[model samples]
Target chain A: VACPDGVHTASNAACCAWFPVLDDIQQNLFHGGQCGAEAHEALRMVFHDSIAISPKLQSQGKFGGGGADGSIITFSSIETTYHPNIGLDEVVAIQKPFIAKHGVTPGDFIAFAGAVGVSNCPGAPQMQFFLGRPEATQAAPDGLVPEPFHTIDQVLARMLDAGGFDEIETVWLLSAHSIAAANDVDPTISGLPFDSTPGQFDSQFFVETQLRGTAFPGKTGIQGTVMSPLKGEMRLQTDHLFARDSRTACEWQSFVNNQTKLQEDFQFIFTALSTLGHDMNAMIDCSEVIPAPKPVNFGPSFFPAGKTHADIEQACASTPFPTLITAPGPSASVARIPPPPSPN
Target chain B: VACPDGVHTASNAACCAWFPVLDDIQQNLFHGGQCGAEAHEALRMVFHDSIAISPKLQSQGKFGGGGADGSIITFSSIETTYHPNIGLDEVVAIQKPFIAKHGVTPGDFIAFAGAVGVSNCPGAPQMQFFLGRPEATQAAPDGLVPEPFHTIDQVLARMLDAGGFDEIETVWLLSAHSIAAANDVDPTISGLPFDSTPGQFDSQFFVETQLRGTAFPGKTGIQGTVMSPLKGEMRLQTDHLFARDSRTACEWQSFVNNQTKLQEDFQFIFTALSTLGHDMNAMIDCSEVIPAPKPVNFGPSFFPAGKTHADIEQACASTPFPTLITAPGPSASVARIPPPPSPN
Candidate 1:
């Protein structure tokens, strides 16, 4: 790959230098297990980190607010503990050492890891990575990040405020939830998957969500339920409100059972999501991003205490997620089972 | 059962006027299924209805903000869908006509059904009942109720703000999660119980919270997941936080293995919870409440189109929730089961 500054050197240079470092972080720290919180963590770090940008503050000529600077990785204490950012600390902690050793900006590393992490999932589209993200010195103000409690209007406003997107993209970005599992914020059912095939970055989330399962038994302590496809999978309130609201319901419904459009839209909007809140002028022009044509090859999948990608794959494939909409009863035994590295 | 106003007459009277009406609601609607959302709905309606009181607003010379009225029953739509009170539509809808036909106030009916609903549970403690509650003509302003997303301190503050309760009371109120289940808020794994035996109110919720089951997987979209003791069972985020935060962790821990304290605390706080915003002066005292000593026979458990309480009991008994935090193996199966009205 060519360098951003048009500095033509060996296939690897200073800009490219961080690539190997990211691999080290991915292979050894992030997707190392290929099926635990690591991969999901990497995916989440970039989104939360990127979404912290406050465009309104920037518009006011104020330099003290939001931007995609990887503050979630550096100034994590308050950033991650503040309601919406829960569970992000672990992923940032795993990347801290590499950021120091590789002399990589938290911004670049977060985006890089996100792309690499998603690629680890079987059919996930590979995101384009750019070099040179400015480092953040202080934590962004709390409450700038979007909350699940937010109504559809606020979600769109926040999405737009962070990276100037509309209701469609806001709805689309929610699909990223399909790739990662939610924990921390929801301590009760901590390891529940957003979709059945959490390890595989596909449109199953949209498809299954639209499919809608049986009504749940009781009221949640926080919000309300909207019947989901799987036993341990979640459909966030934002998604539920969006699905039920006329403003975005059609668009949300459009994505269900339609992989091609969902995938295409996801790539475009996700590309914007990964680089949100950064000075576009500061980034290198490496728009070359595409979904992996074949499964990514990560040698040995496991090292010390980790499990291999093959092992995780075999486990996920053993008893495929039963189709709640079309299939019969005795729901898949692994319906509540976490992906590989369950630690049971 | 004696009447609250001391109008003793036949199987019915002024105060006793509400009991049979309650029995009809219980046997026909609330615990009618004997094992599902009905019992939980009955339990939750009173709580949500009671907590809507805004003592803060009332203290500020405000006349119309919050009160202990049966507006939850009369104003079902906006009242139940408003931010905090999710999935309450069913409960209120079931009681709307009864509130009018019987000429019973929403306040009294809600309180009455709660007591009757809990009694339907095998070992649930009976709560005292009072009368002469003023009816609410309109819904209270939104956001007065406690939300699951609240931290322990916030939960305490909200609890206090709503109806003047302290930390211990705040801790005690969450125990209601035992008999009822969380359904509306968390979409993933709906119908999961709060404890091993959701139908039978006990210290199980507290014991299990202290036990601290393993984490769950996945981000909640429209639904959330809380790590729970059994498959299909949930530990509300509020309860989980109380069990984890140092400020309240001890209280949560103290209830474990101490059924005596748990039961007493629950009865006291629950009594207060049932009548939170009701005017104390315009009421009658009736404190004859106790748990069933022998299993009160329910003639085959069901008389209509519903599963029998016996069937649910037998099913729940088949694979008794294993001891968590001690025993192991992929956690309990109820981890994925939705809350009450469960049919094995």
Candidate 2:
């Protein structure tokens, strides 16, 4: 919900796209094709930014203190103690205009639109999208995000608490593997690029973890004494805790058998991630068809403008963005809703 | 801390260093030096990622429900009613390790790091980072994430709630003037591209917003309602009543005049963000001639076993990573904290 499509693309083909206001930029084969030939430039900037992150600065610690949103700590947004990362208020600030302009609910955007948003990247498969989801409120469920240092059992428990399913669902969620890359540093662990491609989508993430173990940093620390207990308790540095264990172990084994197979199942499961939760009626169907902004509008404009007969007739296949209102004539306020900012 | 540092070593001497990370990778500086002399590869990647990002995904639209952390909802993360941008819980899963391995306090990483991180692409100074003092855990109080549909005054009030600060501190923190090329796609905002230099760290983010009359994506049918009474007061979009707007028109007046001073002061104030809750003693201080990592270990195991103290002293200065052990190997496991696992 945060910057799903913006920061992580929430899917595959969207790599190489910073989505600037949305998420981060990854690498991929089609990066040049879908994201544009300019991907080279985008990746260069972000890569450098990520690398420049100071080793000195990163090694420091957390405030271990906290505060709520609307607090000074909230605006500054730093220090683990203060819930500094809680930018829900900020997310809503952005959504208000979107709902106003597009008339689509946030849930729908996530359920249906998120699937499509992720598809733009292409690293992962084109999962399905739905509609009828209701609008989201300003409050996020408490403690939804997993704690970084939680044990596998604790992490799984929290995931379940947040509504995640068995190993399969875990795979689906982790399927974001195509987009998210593991950090270079995590406690005692380091150096496990999210994927072989590092910047593109691939089943390598899940498969590799299955073969070796989850590369999530610090995944192999001691549990009292040993991280790798007996066969059912061997802790790998990957996310396949279940595979290494019992019941869940089967799922891990299957995913590791073949990446192609893993991807197939991954596709089947992630759909639930974007779907599930909310009213199944008032939303737009997958085919709602958001048109790309014309003239000045470079990409899809989600919801087109059309309430009355005249409005419908003019917009229906009319030049789209730029054609709707070719040029602006000096009024700073005369925005055409779906097209570019005025003044040609 | 966002991306900070100027550009090449010439022009804005202040602008030049722009952190070795942002060092005109496009020009082949530092790590980018690998891409020809111009760091063309890095530059190309940044450009590609930038433009593609701006219009790609709008920032996520989330929350409007509960305002607390640890709220476990059965609904989905993206769909449940709640704010998506400013919560410490979700964002920290990634932030934690980044801070851990880098050994910097989580606070410093976010505040000053934002600048350094943004420095990769060349824009404003909003997204740059540099090191500085850290706050005590018990100090630098927490809980300040902002709320949606807030007013300018309310926004300020919220900031004041944490560690209670004067108006000046409030103003300095507001220097989060980041300009991204695009909005993220998760929650979907209505095309909220702040400025052209989304990748760079600059004051443009704040400047442009002020220039725009704070009018943002207003909700439909709501007529003249305010979007975020705090940041986007008129154009009316979402409900964002600021915590600091008790003073109103006067607050807006101060925002503009204090921009520059805020940037510099912010550099000073946020430096404290890194040390917010860290054991300064635990962190290796760069203040003096800090010994290098390889210094004690030297290369491979070229230990001059029989070398006397005099011989060891003679070679210490010449060897970048001095390794003539002053003592013999560890007498027990307890004496030597074992190295973590390595590749099989």
Candidate 3:
């Protein structure tokens, strides 16, 4: 076993035990007709559970500080009802027994499971996992979790306080939304995926946030005719505002239409988001970072549609992905400035 | 004055105190300019907390059961991460102090406030407020909440056991998504309102679900296609499947083009969803139901665009609601299309 230094073998077993269990979980619980739901929800659970960082309040001597302590799981009684922290009740439930059995902290379970879950999906990076976070005895003070309802400044203020994150890291973190889905707002149709292709972890969220959203058709006194991607969709004010704001627009724009860097940034930022506010001295570095699964040579609908192997292969061959321009820069460059608007 | 028997006036006062505080919260915390995030989350919390009940499981000698006991709040340490329950931490936090000050149980506060929050939203139902729910001493057992990934049969089996709801009741209950939004899937965007007009509570979730939702362009084999009202939108699997499923299709379609009946059913069903597994004899029916706010005539973009009252008024009067059919039955009648081309 390639254990990282200072990580005990027993500790490794406790942590590594989750992978097999997770495989079963992914197969049994997560592998619905739409396999994406569990992965999306698990990733969401990790984000909400770990996002409650508030170092500023800690500096102010607030008794209840926030961070990647997994209070979302440990003190869920307190941290679960803020508007932005919805839909995680069962994720915690599912993961709790494993934590109890493994003798690992809730924070570690959350962080590590998120890494494992995302990696389990296609095209996701293998996030690094560490252990040994001291379990939180209580929930953090309310309002510590950043909200999409806030403007960028307020959002960042809380993010900084919680994890000392700046705008760049903050925007980079937004990419996680790229592959996830939203049902909190519109429950009727469940899979209002963030990007065009929710199954693939990609940068479409940033691109689609700007491109896909259209001026809402009717009279809505909400966000000045807020641009909507489609029916049964939602855009957090924080993300909407950030993308529109000049300071971060370039970064948001840069991420749009660029898949390679987006994936890289998403991996780095998601890891950072998960590990916020933990003391390094109290941690054990896990050597086993789970790898992505092998891609099956079948059409996307093979599993859910119950297509035969030959049918899936035929479909895959019939509708192949356009030869992705492997070279850096735009996959297909935009027309160079309309040639100064067609000089009559 | 329609307070149920056994409800206390003092209890009403205590719960009513939340109204003013919620006003501030709506302005300071939940304002979002869209004014829907907190309300959506509050409603979700109530659903998840209450959804944990399973009379079937109870009959089978299960130790823990879910109900209107405020477990989503009291045992949020456990209930907040179950995936189906997302985006509700701060809403609970914001309400905690008030709950403590008012001497209300977590269960009472969750149920009552959820009713109030939904009613407070523009054009939403005036939900019944129940009280006297005992606070949870600890979290409920995990795996109680339902997930979208499961089949409608599986979902209903649990919902029936948990809340004693049938397919019709389940489909009706699912309509709560009409006015809410999502952030779990799409992080950058929020307020993925469910209907044609997200701010207004309507039957759009059902109607639009059937009409809209295209093949999710560029797939990874997730749901065949996600229905997006506009950018940053989402639809839950339960709502989508319930509508599509044969057993529940009638109920789903019944609400599709009927707003009046939909609102009536939504109010009744939502109340039921919030009060699973409780002692009715001991419950207090609060007299005070939170009222909706005054409608400021303006477009959804009014405030966010930095427009003034005069500008808003001018815009409102100039671009009136296109003389809506005044009587509701599918705003615009459609020529009976050929027996709807095979769904496949």
Candidate 4:
């Protein structure tokens, strides 16, 4: 049946009570239809919350962290101090007032904000959202979220152990990097994006990661910083390694120049990532409430403004990098993404 | 601007994220389109929650209780045992699962449910609802909800001191009796209604309250019981006293056969009553989220089936009761209102 006020939903034929909440998050938290700092942080926050769970550890009778259970925000005093969760304090504080004002649980809020955040990015799919997660009882166990400096095998193993994601799924999930930036990967140089077009959820990040690492964008000794292809970009060591690793290299290259596949894969994997600890049956499927992403108009993938094919250093040996024309312009350097509003 | 999903609101011009929640309550808790036991209990629930505050006591340096803060449900362990709050346990139990499922504060749920419940009643005006009440901090202080046995002086004092409602407003608020029943006023008779048309939200209760007492519906000595004008109906001593007391008698008489005045007055008084302890500034104005009440089709006020105008004992000294027609039928007795669904 339609909602009492006449809102209709075809998926579960359920009323969409959370439409206003998503709209508020979109307008106030997301800066009203723009994908920027808060949206990127929200996207990053869900990964920190969910990637901590380890079913393998739970099977071994250990205190496996609750995946996507919002322990990052609820136990920020502890979780925010962990190496992998640093820089999330601002986003946590940003979300706390909304949790209080809207009266949604921290878990539900984190998952929902992440979904809404991605929807603000052009070319991103409207992600699924589920409500009714219980509050966290304790801090998630430390050292579970994958760090940038981890070796390829260590990264793959963690994704498999914690999230049951194989190498292909891991590469698919990293599509988040399409619109992400490195806030503190190198403390001296913050807001270095992973791809040239950091504001768009296109396949550039997949192609960019495979480009030859020509120079380090920040301090060479920073654990997570790696040599980047473009003048202003910062590559995570994990992304650099994953692009060349045989098991994931083929799938990583598959996204280059194919926006639809990237959007579809990311939507599927992120939905799985966002509901790690909760039972699907226990939560209400409010996915239909998520707003559709704005359409991207950056026609056919090519070199970003001022770059050329000569700049690409192909790492995927499985196949030649798809040929494309470069945007006509003098060689231009990338710009640093601005930092999010500071949390007091 | 419209909601992200396109729902529009003219008052706040704000998006309504709560439409789905209200729909769920209307369909599940309110039994879709009917007003019966649950609706009556919900109307009663709001009063018991709101009337316990005493600004008089607080100004004198005391814990005056949090009015309309869902303290009755949040602190059920303590408040449910109070004399005025005894029968609420069933409704509280009924509401707990919805609160857990929706992830709303108990205060918001109680207020919202009461508003939604009344909206199901024919002729009840859509009540204003606000979102974002914090949970109760403590149980309400004892004996603040004026009991049925309270004398007119005591009842008026409690309404004035706790709610700042004058005698006229108190009489206006009692319009809830139009759709209420007594579950335990006389424990031996569980569902004794206060008027003949217990299923409707008409001004019949006002007309009936002024009717002269004839016989007792249940055990006569019960502290809250009083002489009733009908064989199966109930009359609280407070209602009987207020119907004739000079301070309230004229206002009470004005509601008889005047449905529009009763609805208008009740709506205004209840909006004030429901927000007694809340700072409306701190809450979101989701009043537009409340559904319009169903229309009452019982054409111009007349005595209910089998009753005659002679049954009404006019007690107002200032004005004569407005003329009303009696239904064409042999004299018949009133039916006991069925008790609510049992709490498991």
DockQ (Cα-based) for each candidate = 0.01, 0.01, 0.01, 0.01
Better of 1 and 3 by TM-score: 1
Model 2 agreement with the true structure over A120-153: per-residue lDDT tens digits: 4333344544444344222332233343344567
lDDT tens string, model 2, B1-344?
Answer: 22233222332232222233233221222222111111112221221111111110122442222211111111224321233232222333323444445454333334333433333332222322333324221211112333334545655554443324455565555443233321221122322333312322333333333322323333433432433212212222211212113332233233332334534565554433333323445543322111110000000111212222233212112222222222121110000001112111
Runs off by more than 4 Å, candidate 4: A1-15, A305-307, B1-344
Better of 1 and 4 by TM-score: 4
**Best-to-worst ranking by lDDT:** 4, 1, 3, 2
TM-scores of the candidates are 0.43, 0.30, 0.41, 0.49
lDDT of 1 by residue, A184-280 (tens): 4445666666665565555555545544444432234445345554445566666567655666666765654344565577767767877665656
Q: For candidate 2, give the docking quality class from DockQ.
A: incorrect
Interface RMSD of each: 22.9, 30.0, 22.9, 33.5
Candidate 2 residue spans exceeding 4 A from truth? A1-103, A137-140, A151-164, A182-193, A210-240, A257-260, A279-284, A287-344, B1-22, B25-344
- A114 Cα displacement, candidate 1 (Å): 0.5
For model 4, residues B1-344, the per-residue Cα lDDT tens digits are 46665755435543265676777776677654457677888888889988889888788898999998889988998898988887888889988888888777788877788888887766677688877678889888997988888899998899888877889889999899988888877768888888776656887788777777778988876777678877778899889898888888889988876767877888888878888898878777788888767544243455644456677777778797876655322343455656656663
**Isolated chain B TM-score per model:** 0.77, 0.40, 0.73, 0.93
Model 1 per-residue lDDT tens digits across residues B1-344: 45564644433244556545755674566423243466667778777887877767777876434456887776776687787787676556666777777887888777776766666554344466776677777777777777777666777877778777888788787777867665665644455566654654555565556544454532332223365434445666776677666566667656544445666787788778876765666677544322132121111001111111221111122233222222111223332223334221
Candidates sorted by TM-score, best first:
4, 1, 3, 2
Evaluated on CA atoms against the true complex, candidate 4 attains a DockQ of 0.01
Better of 3 and 4 by TM-score: 4
lDDT, candidate 4, at A314:
69
Global CA lDDT computed for model 3: 0.54
Identify the leading candidate in terms of TM-score: 4
Residue B322 error for model 2, in Å?
A: 49
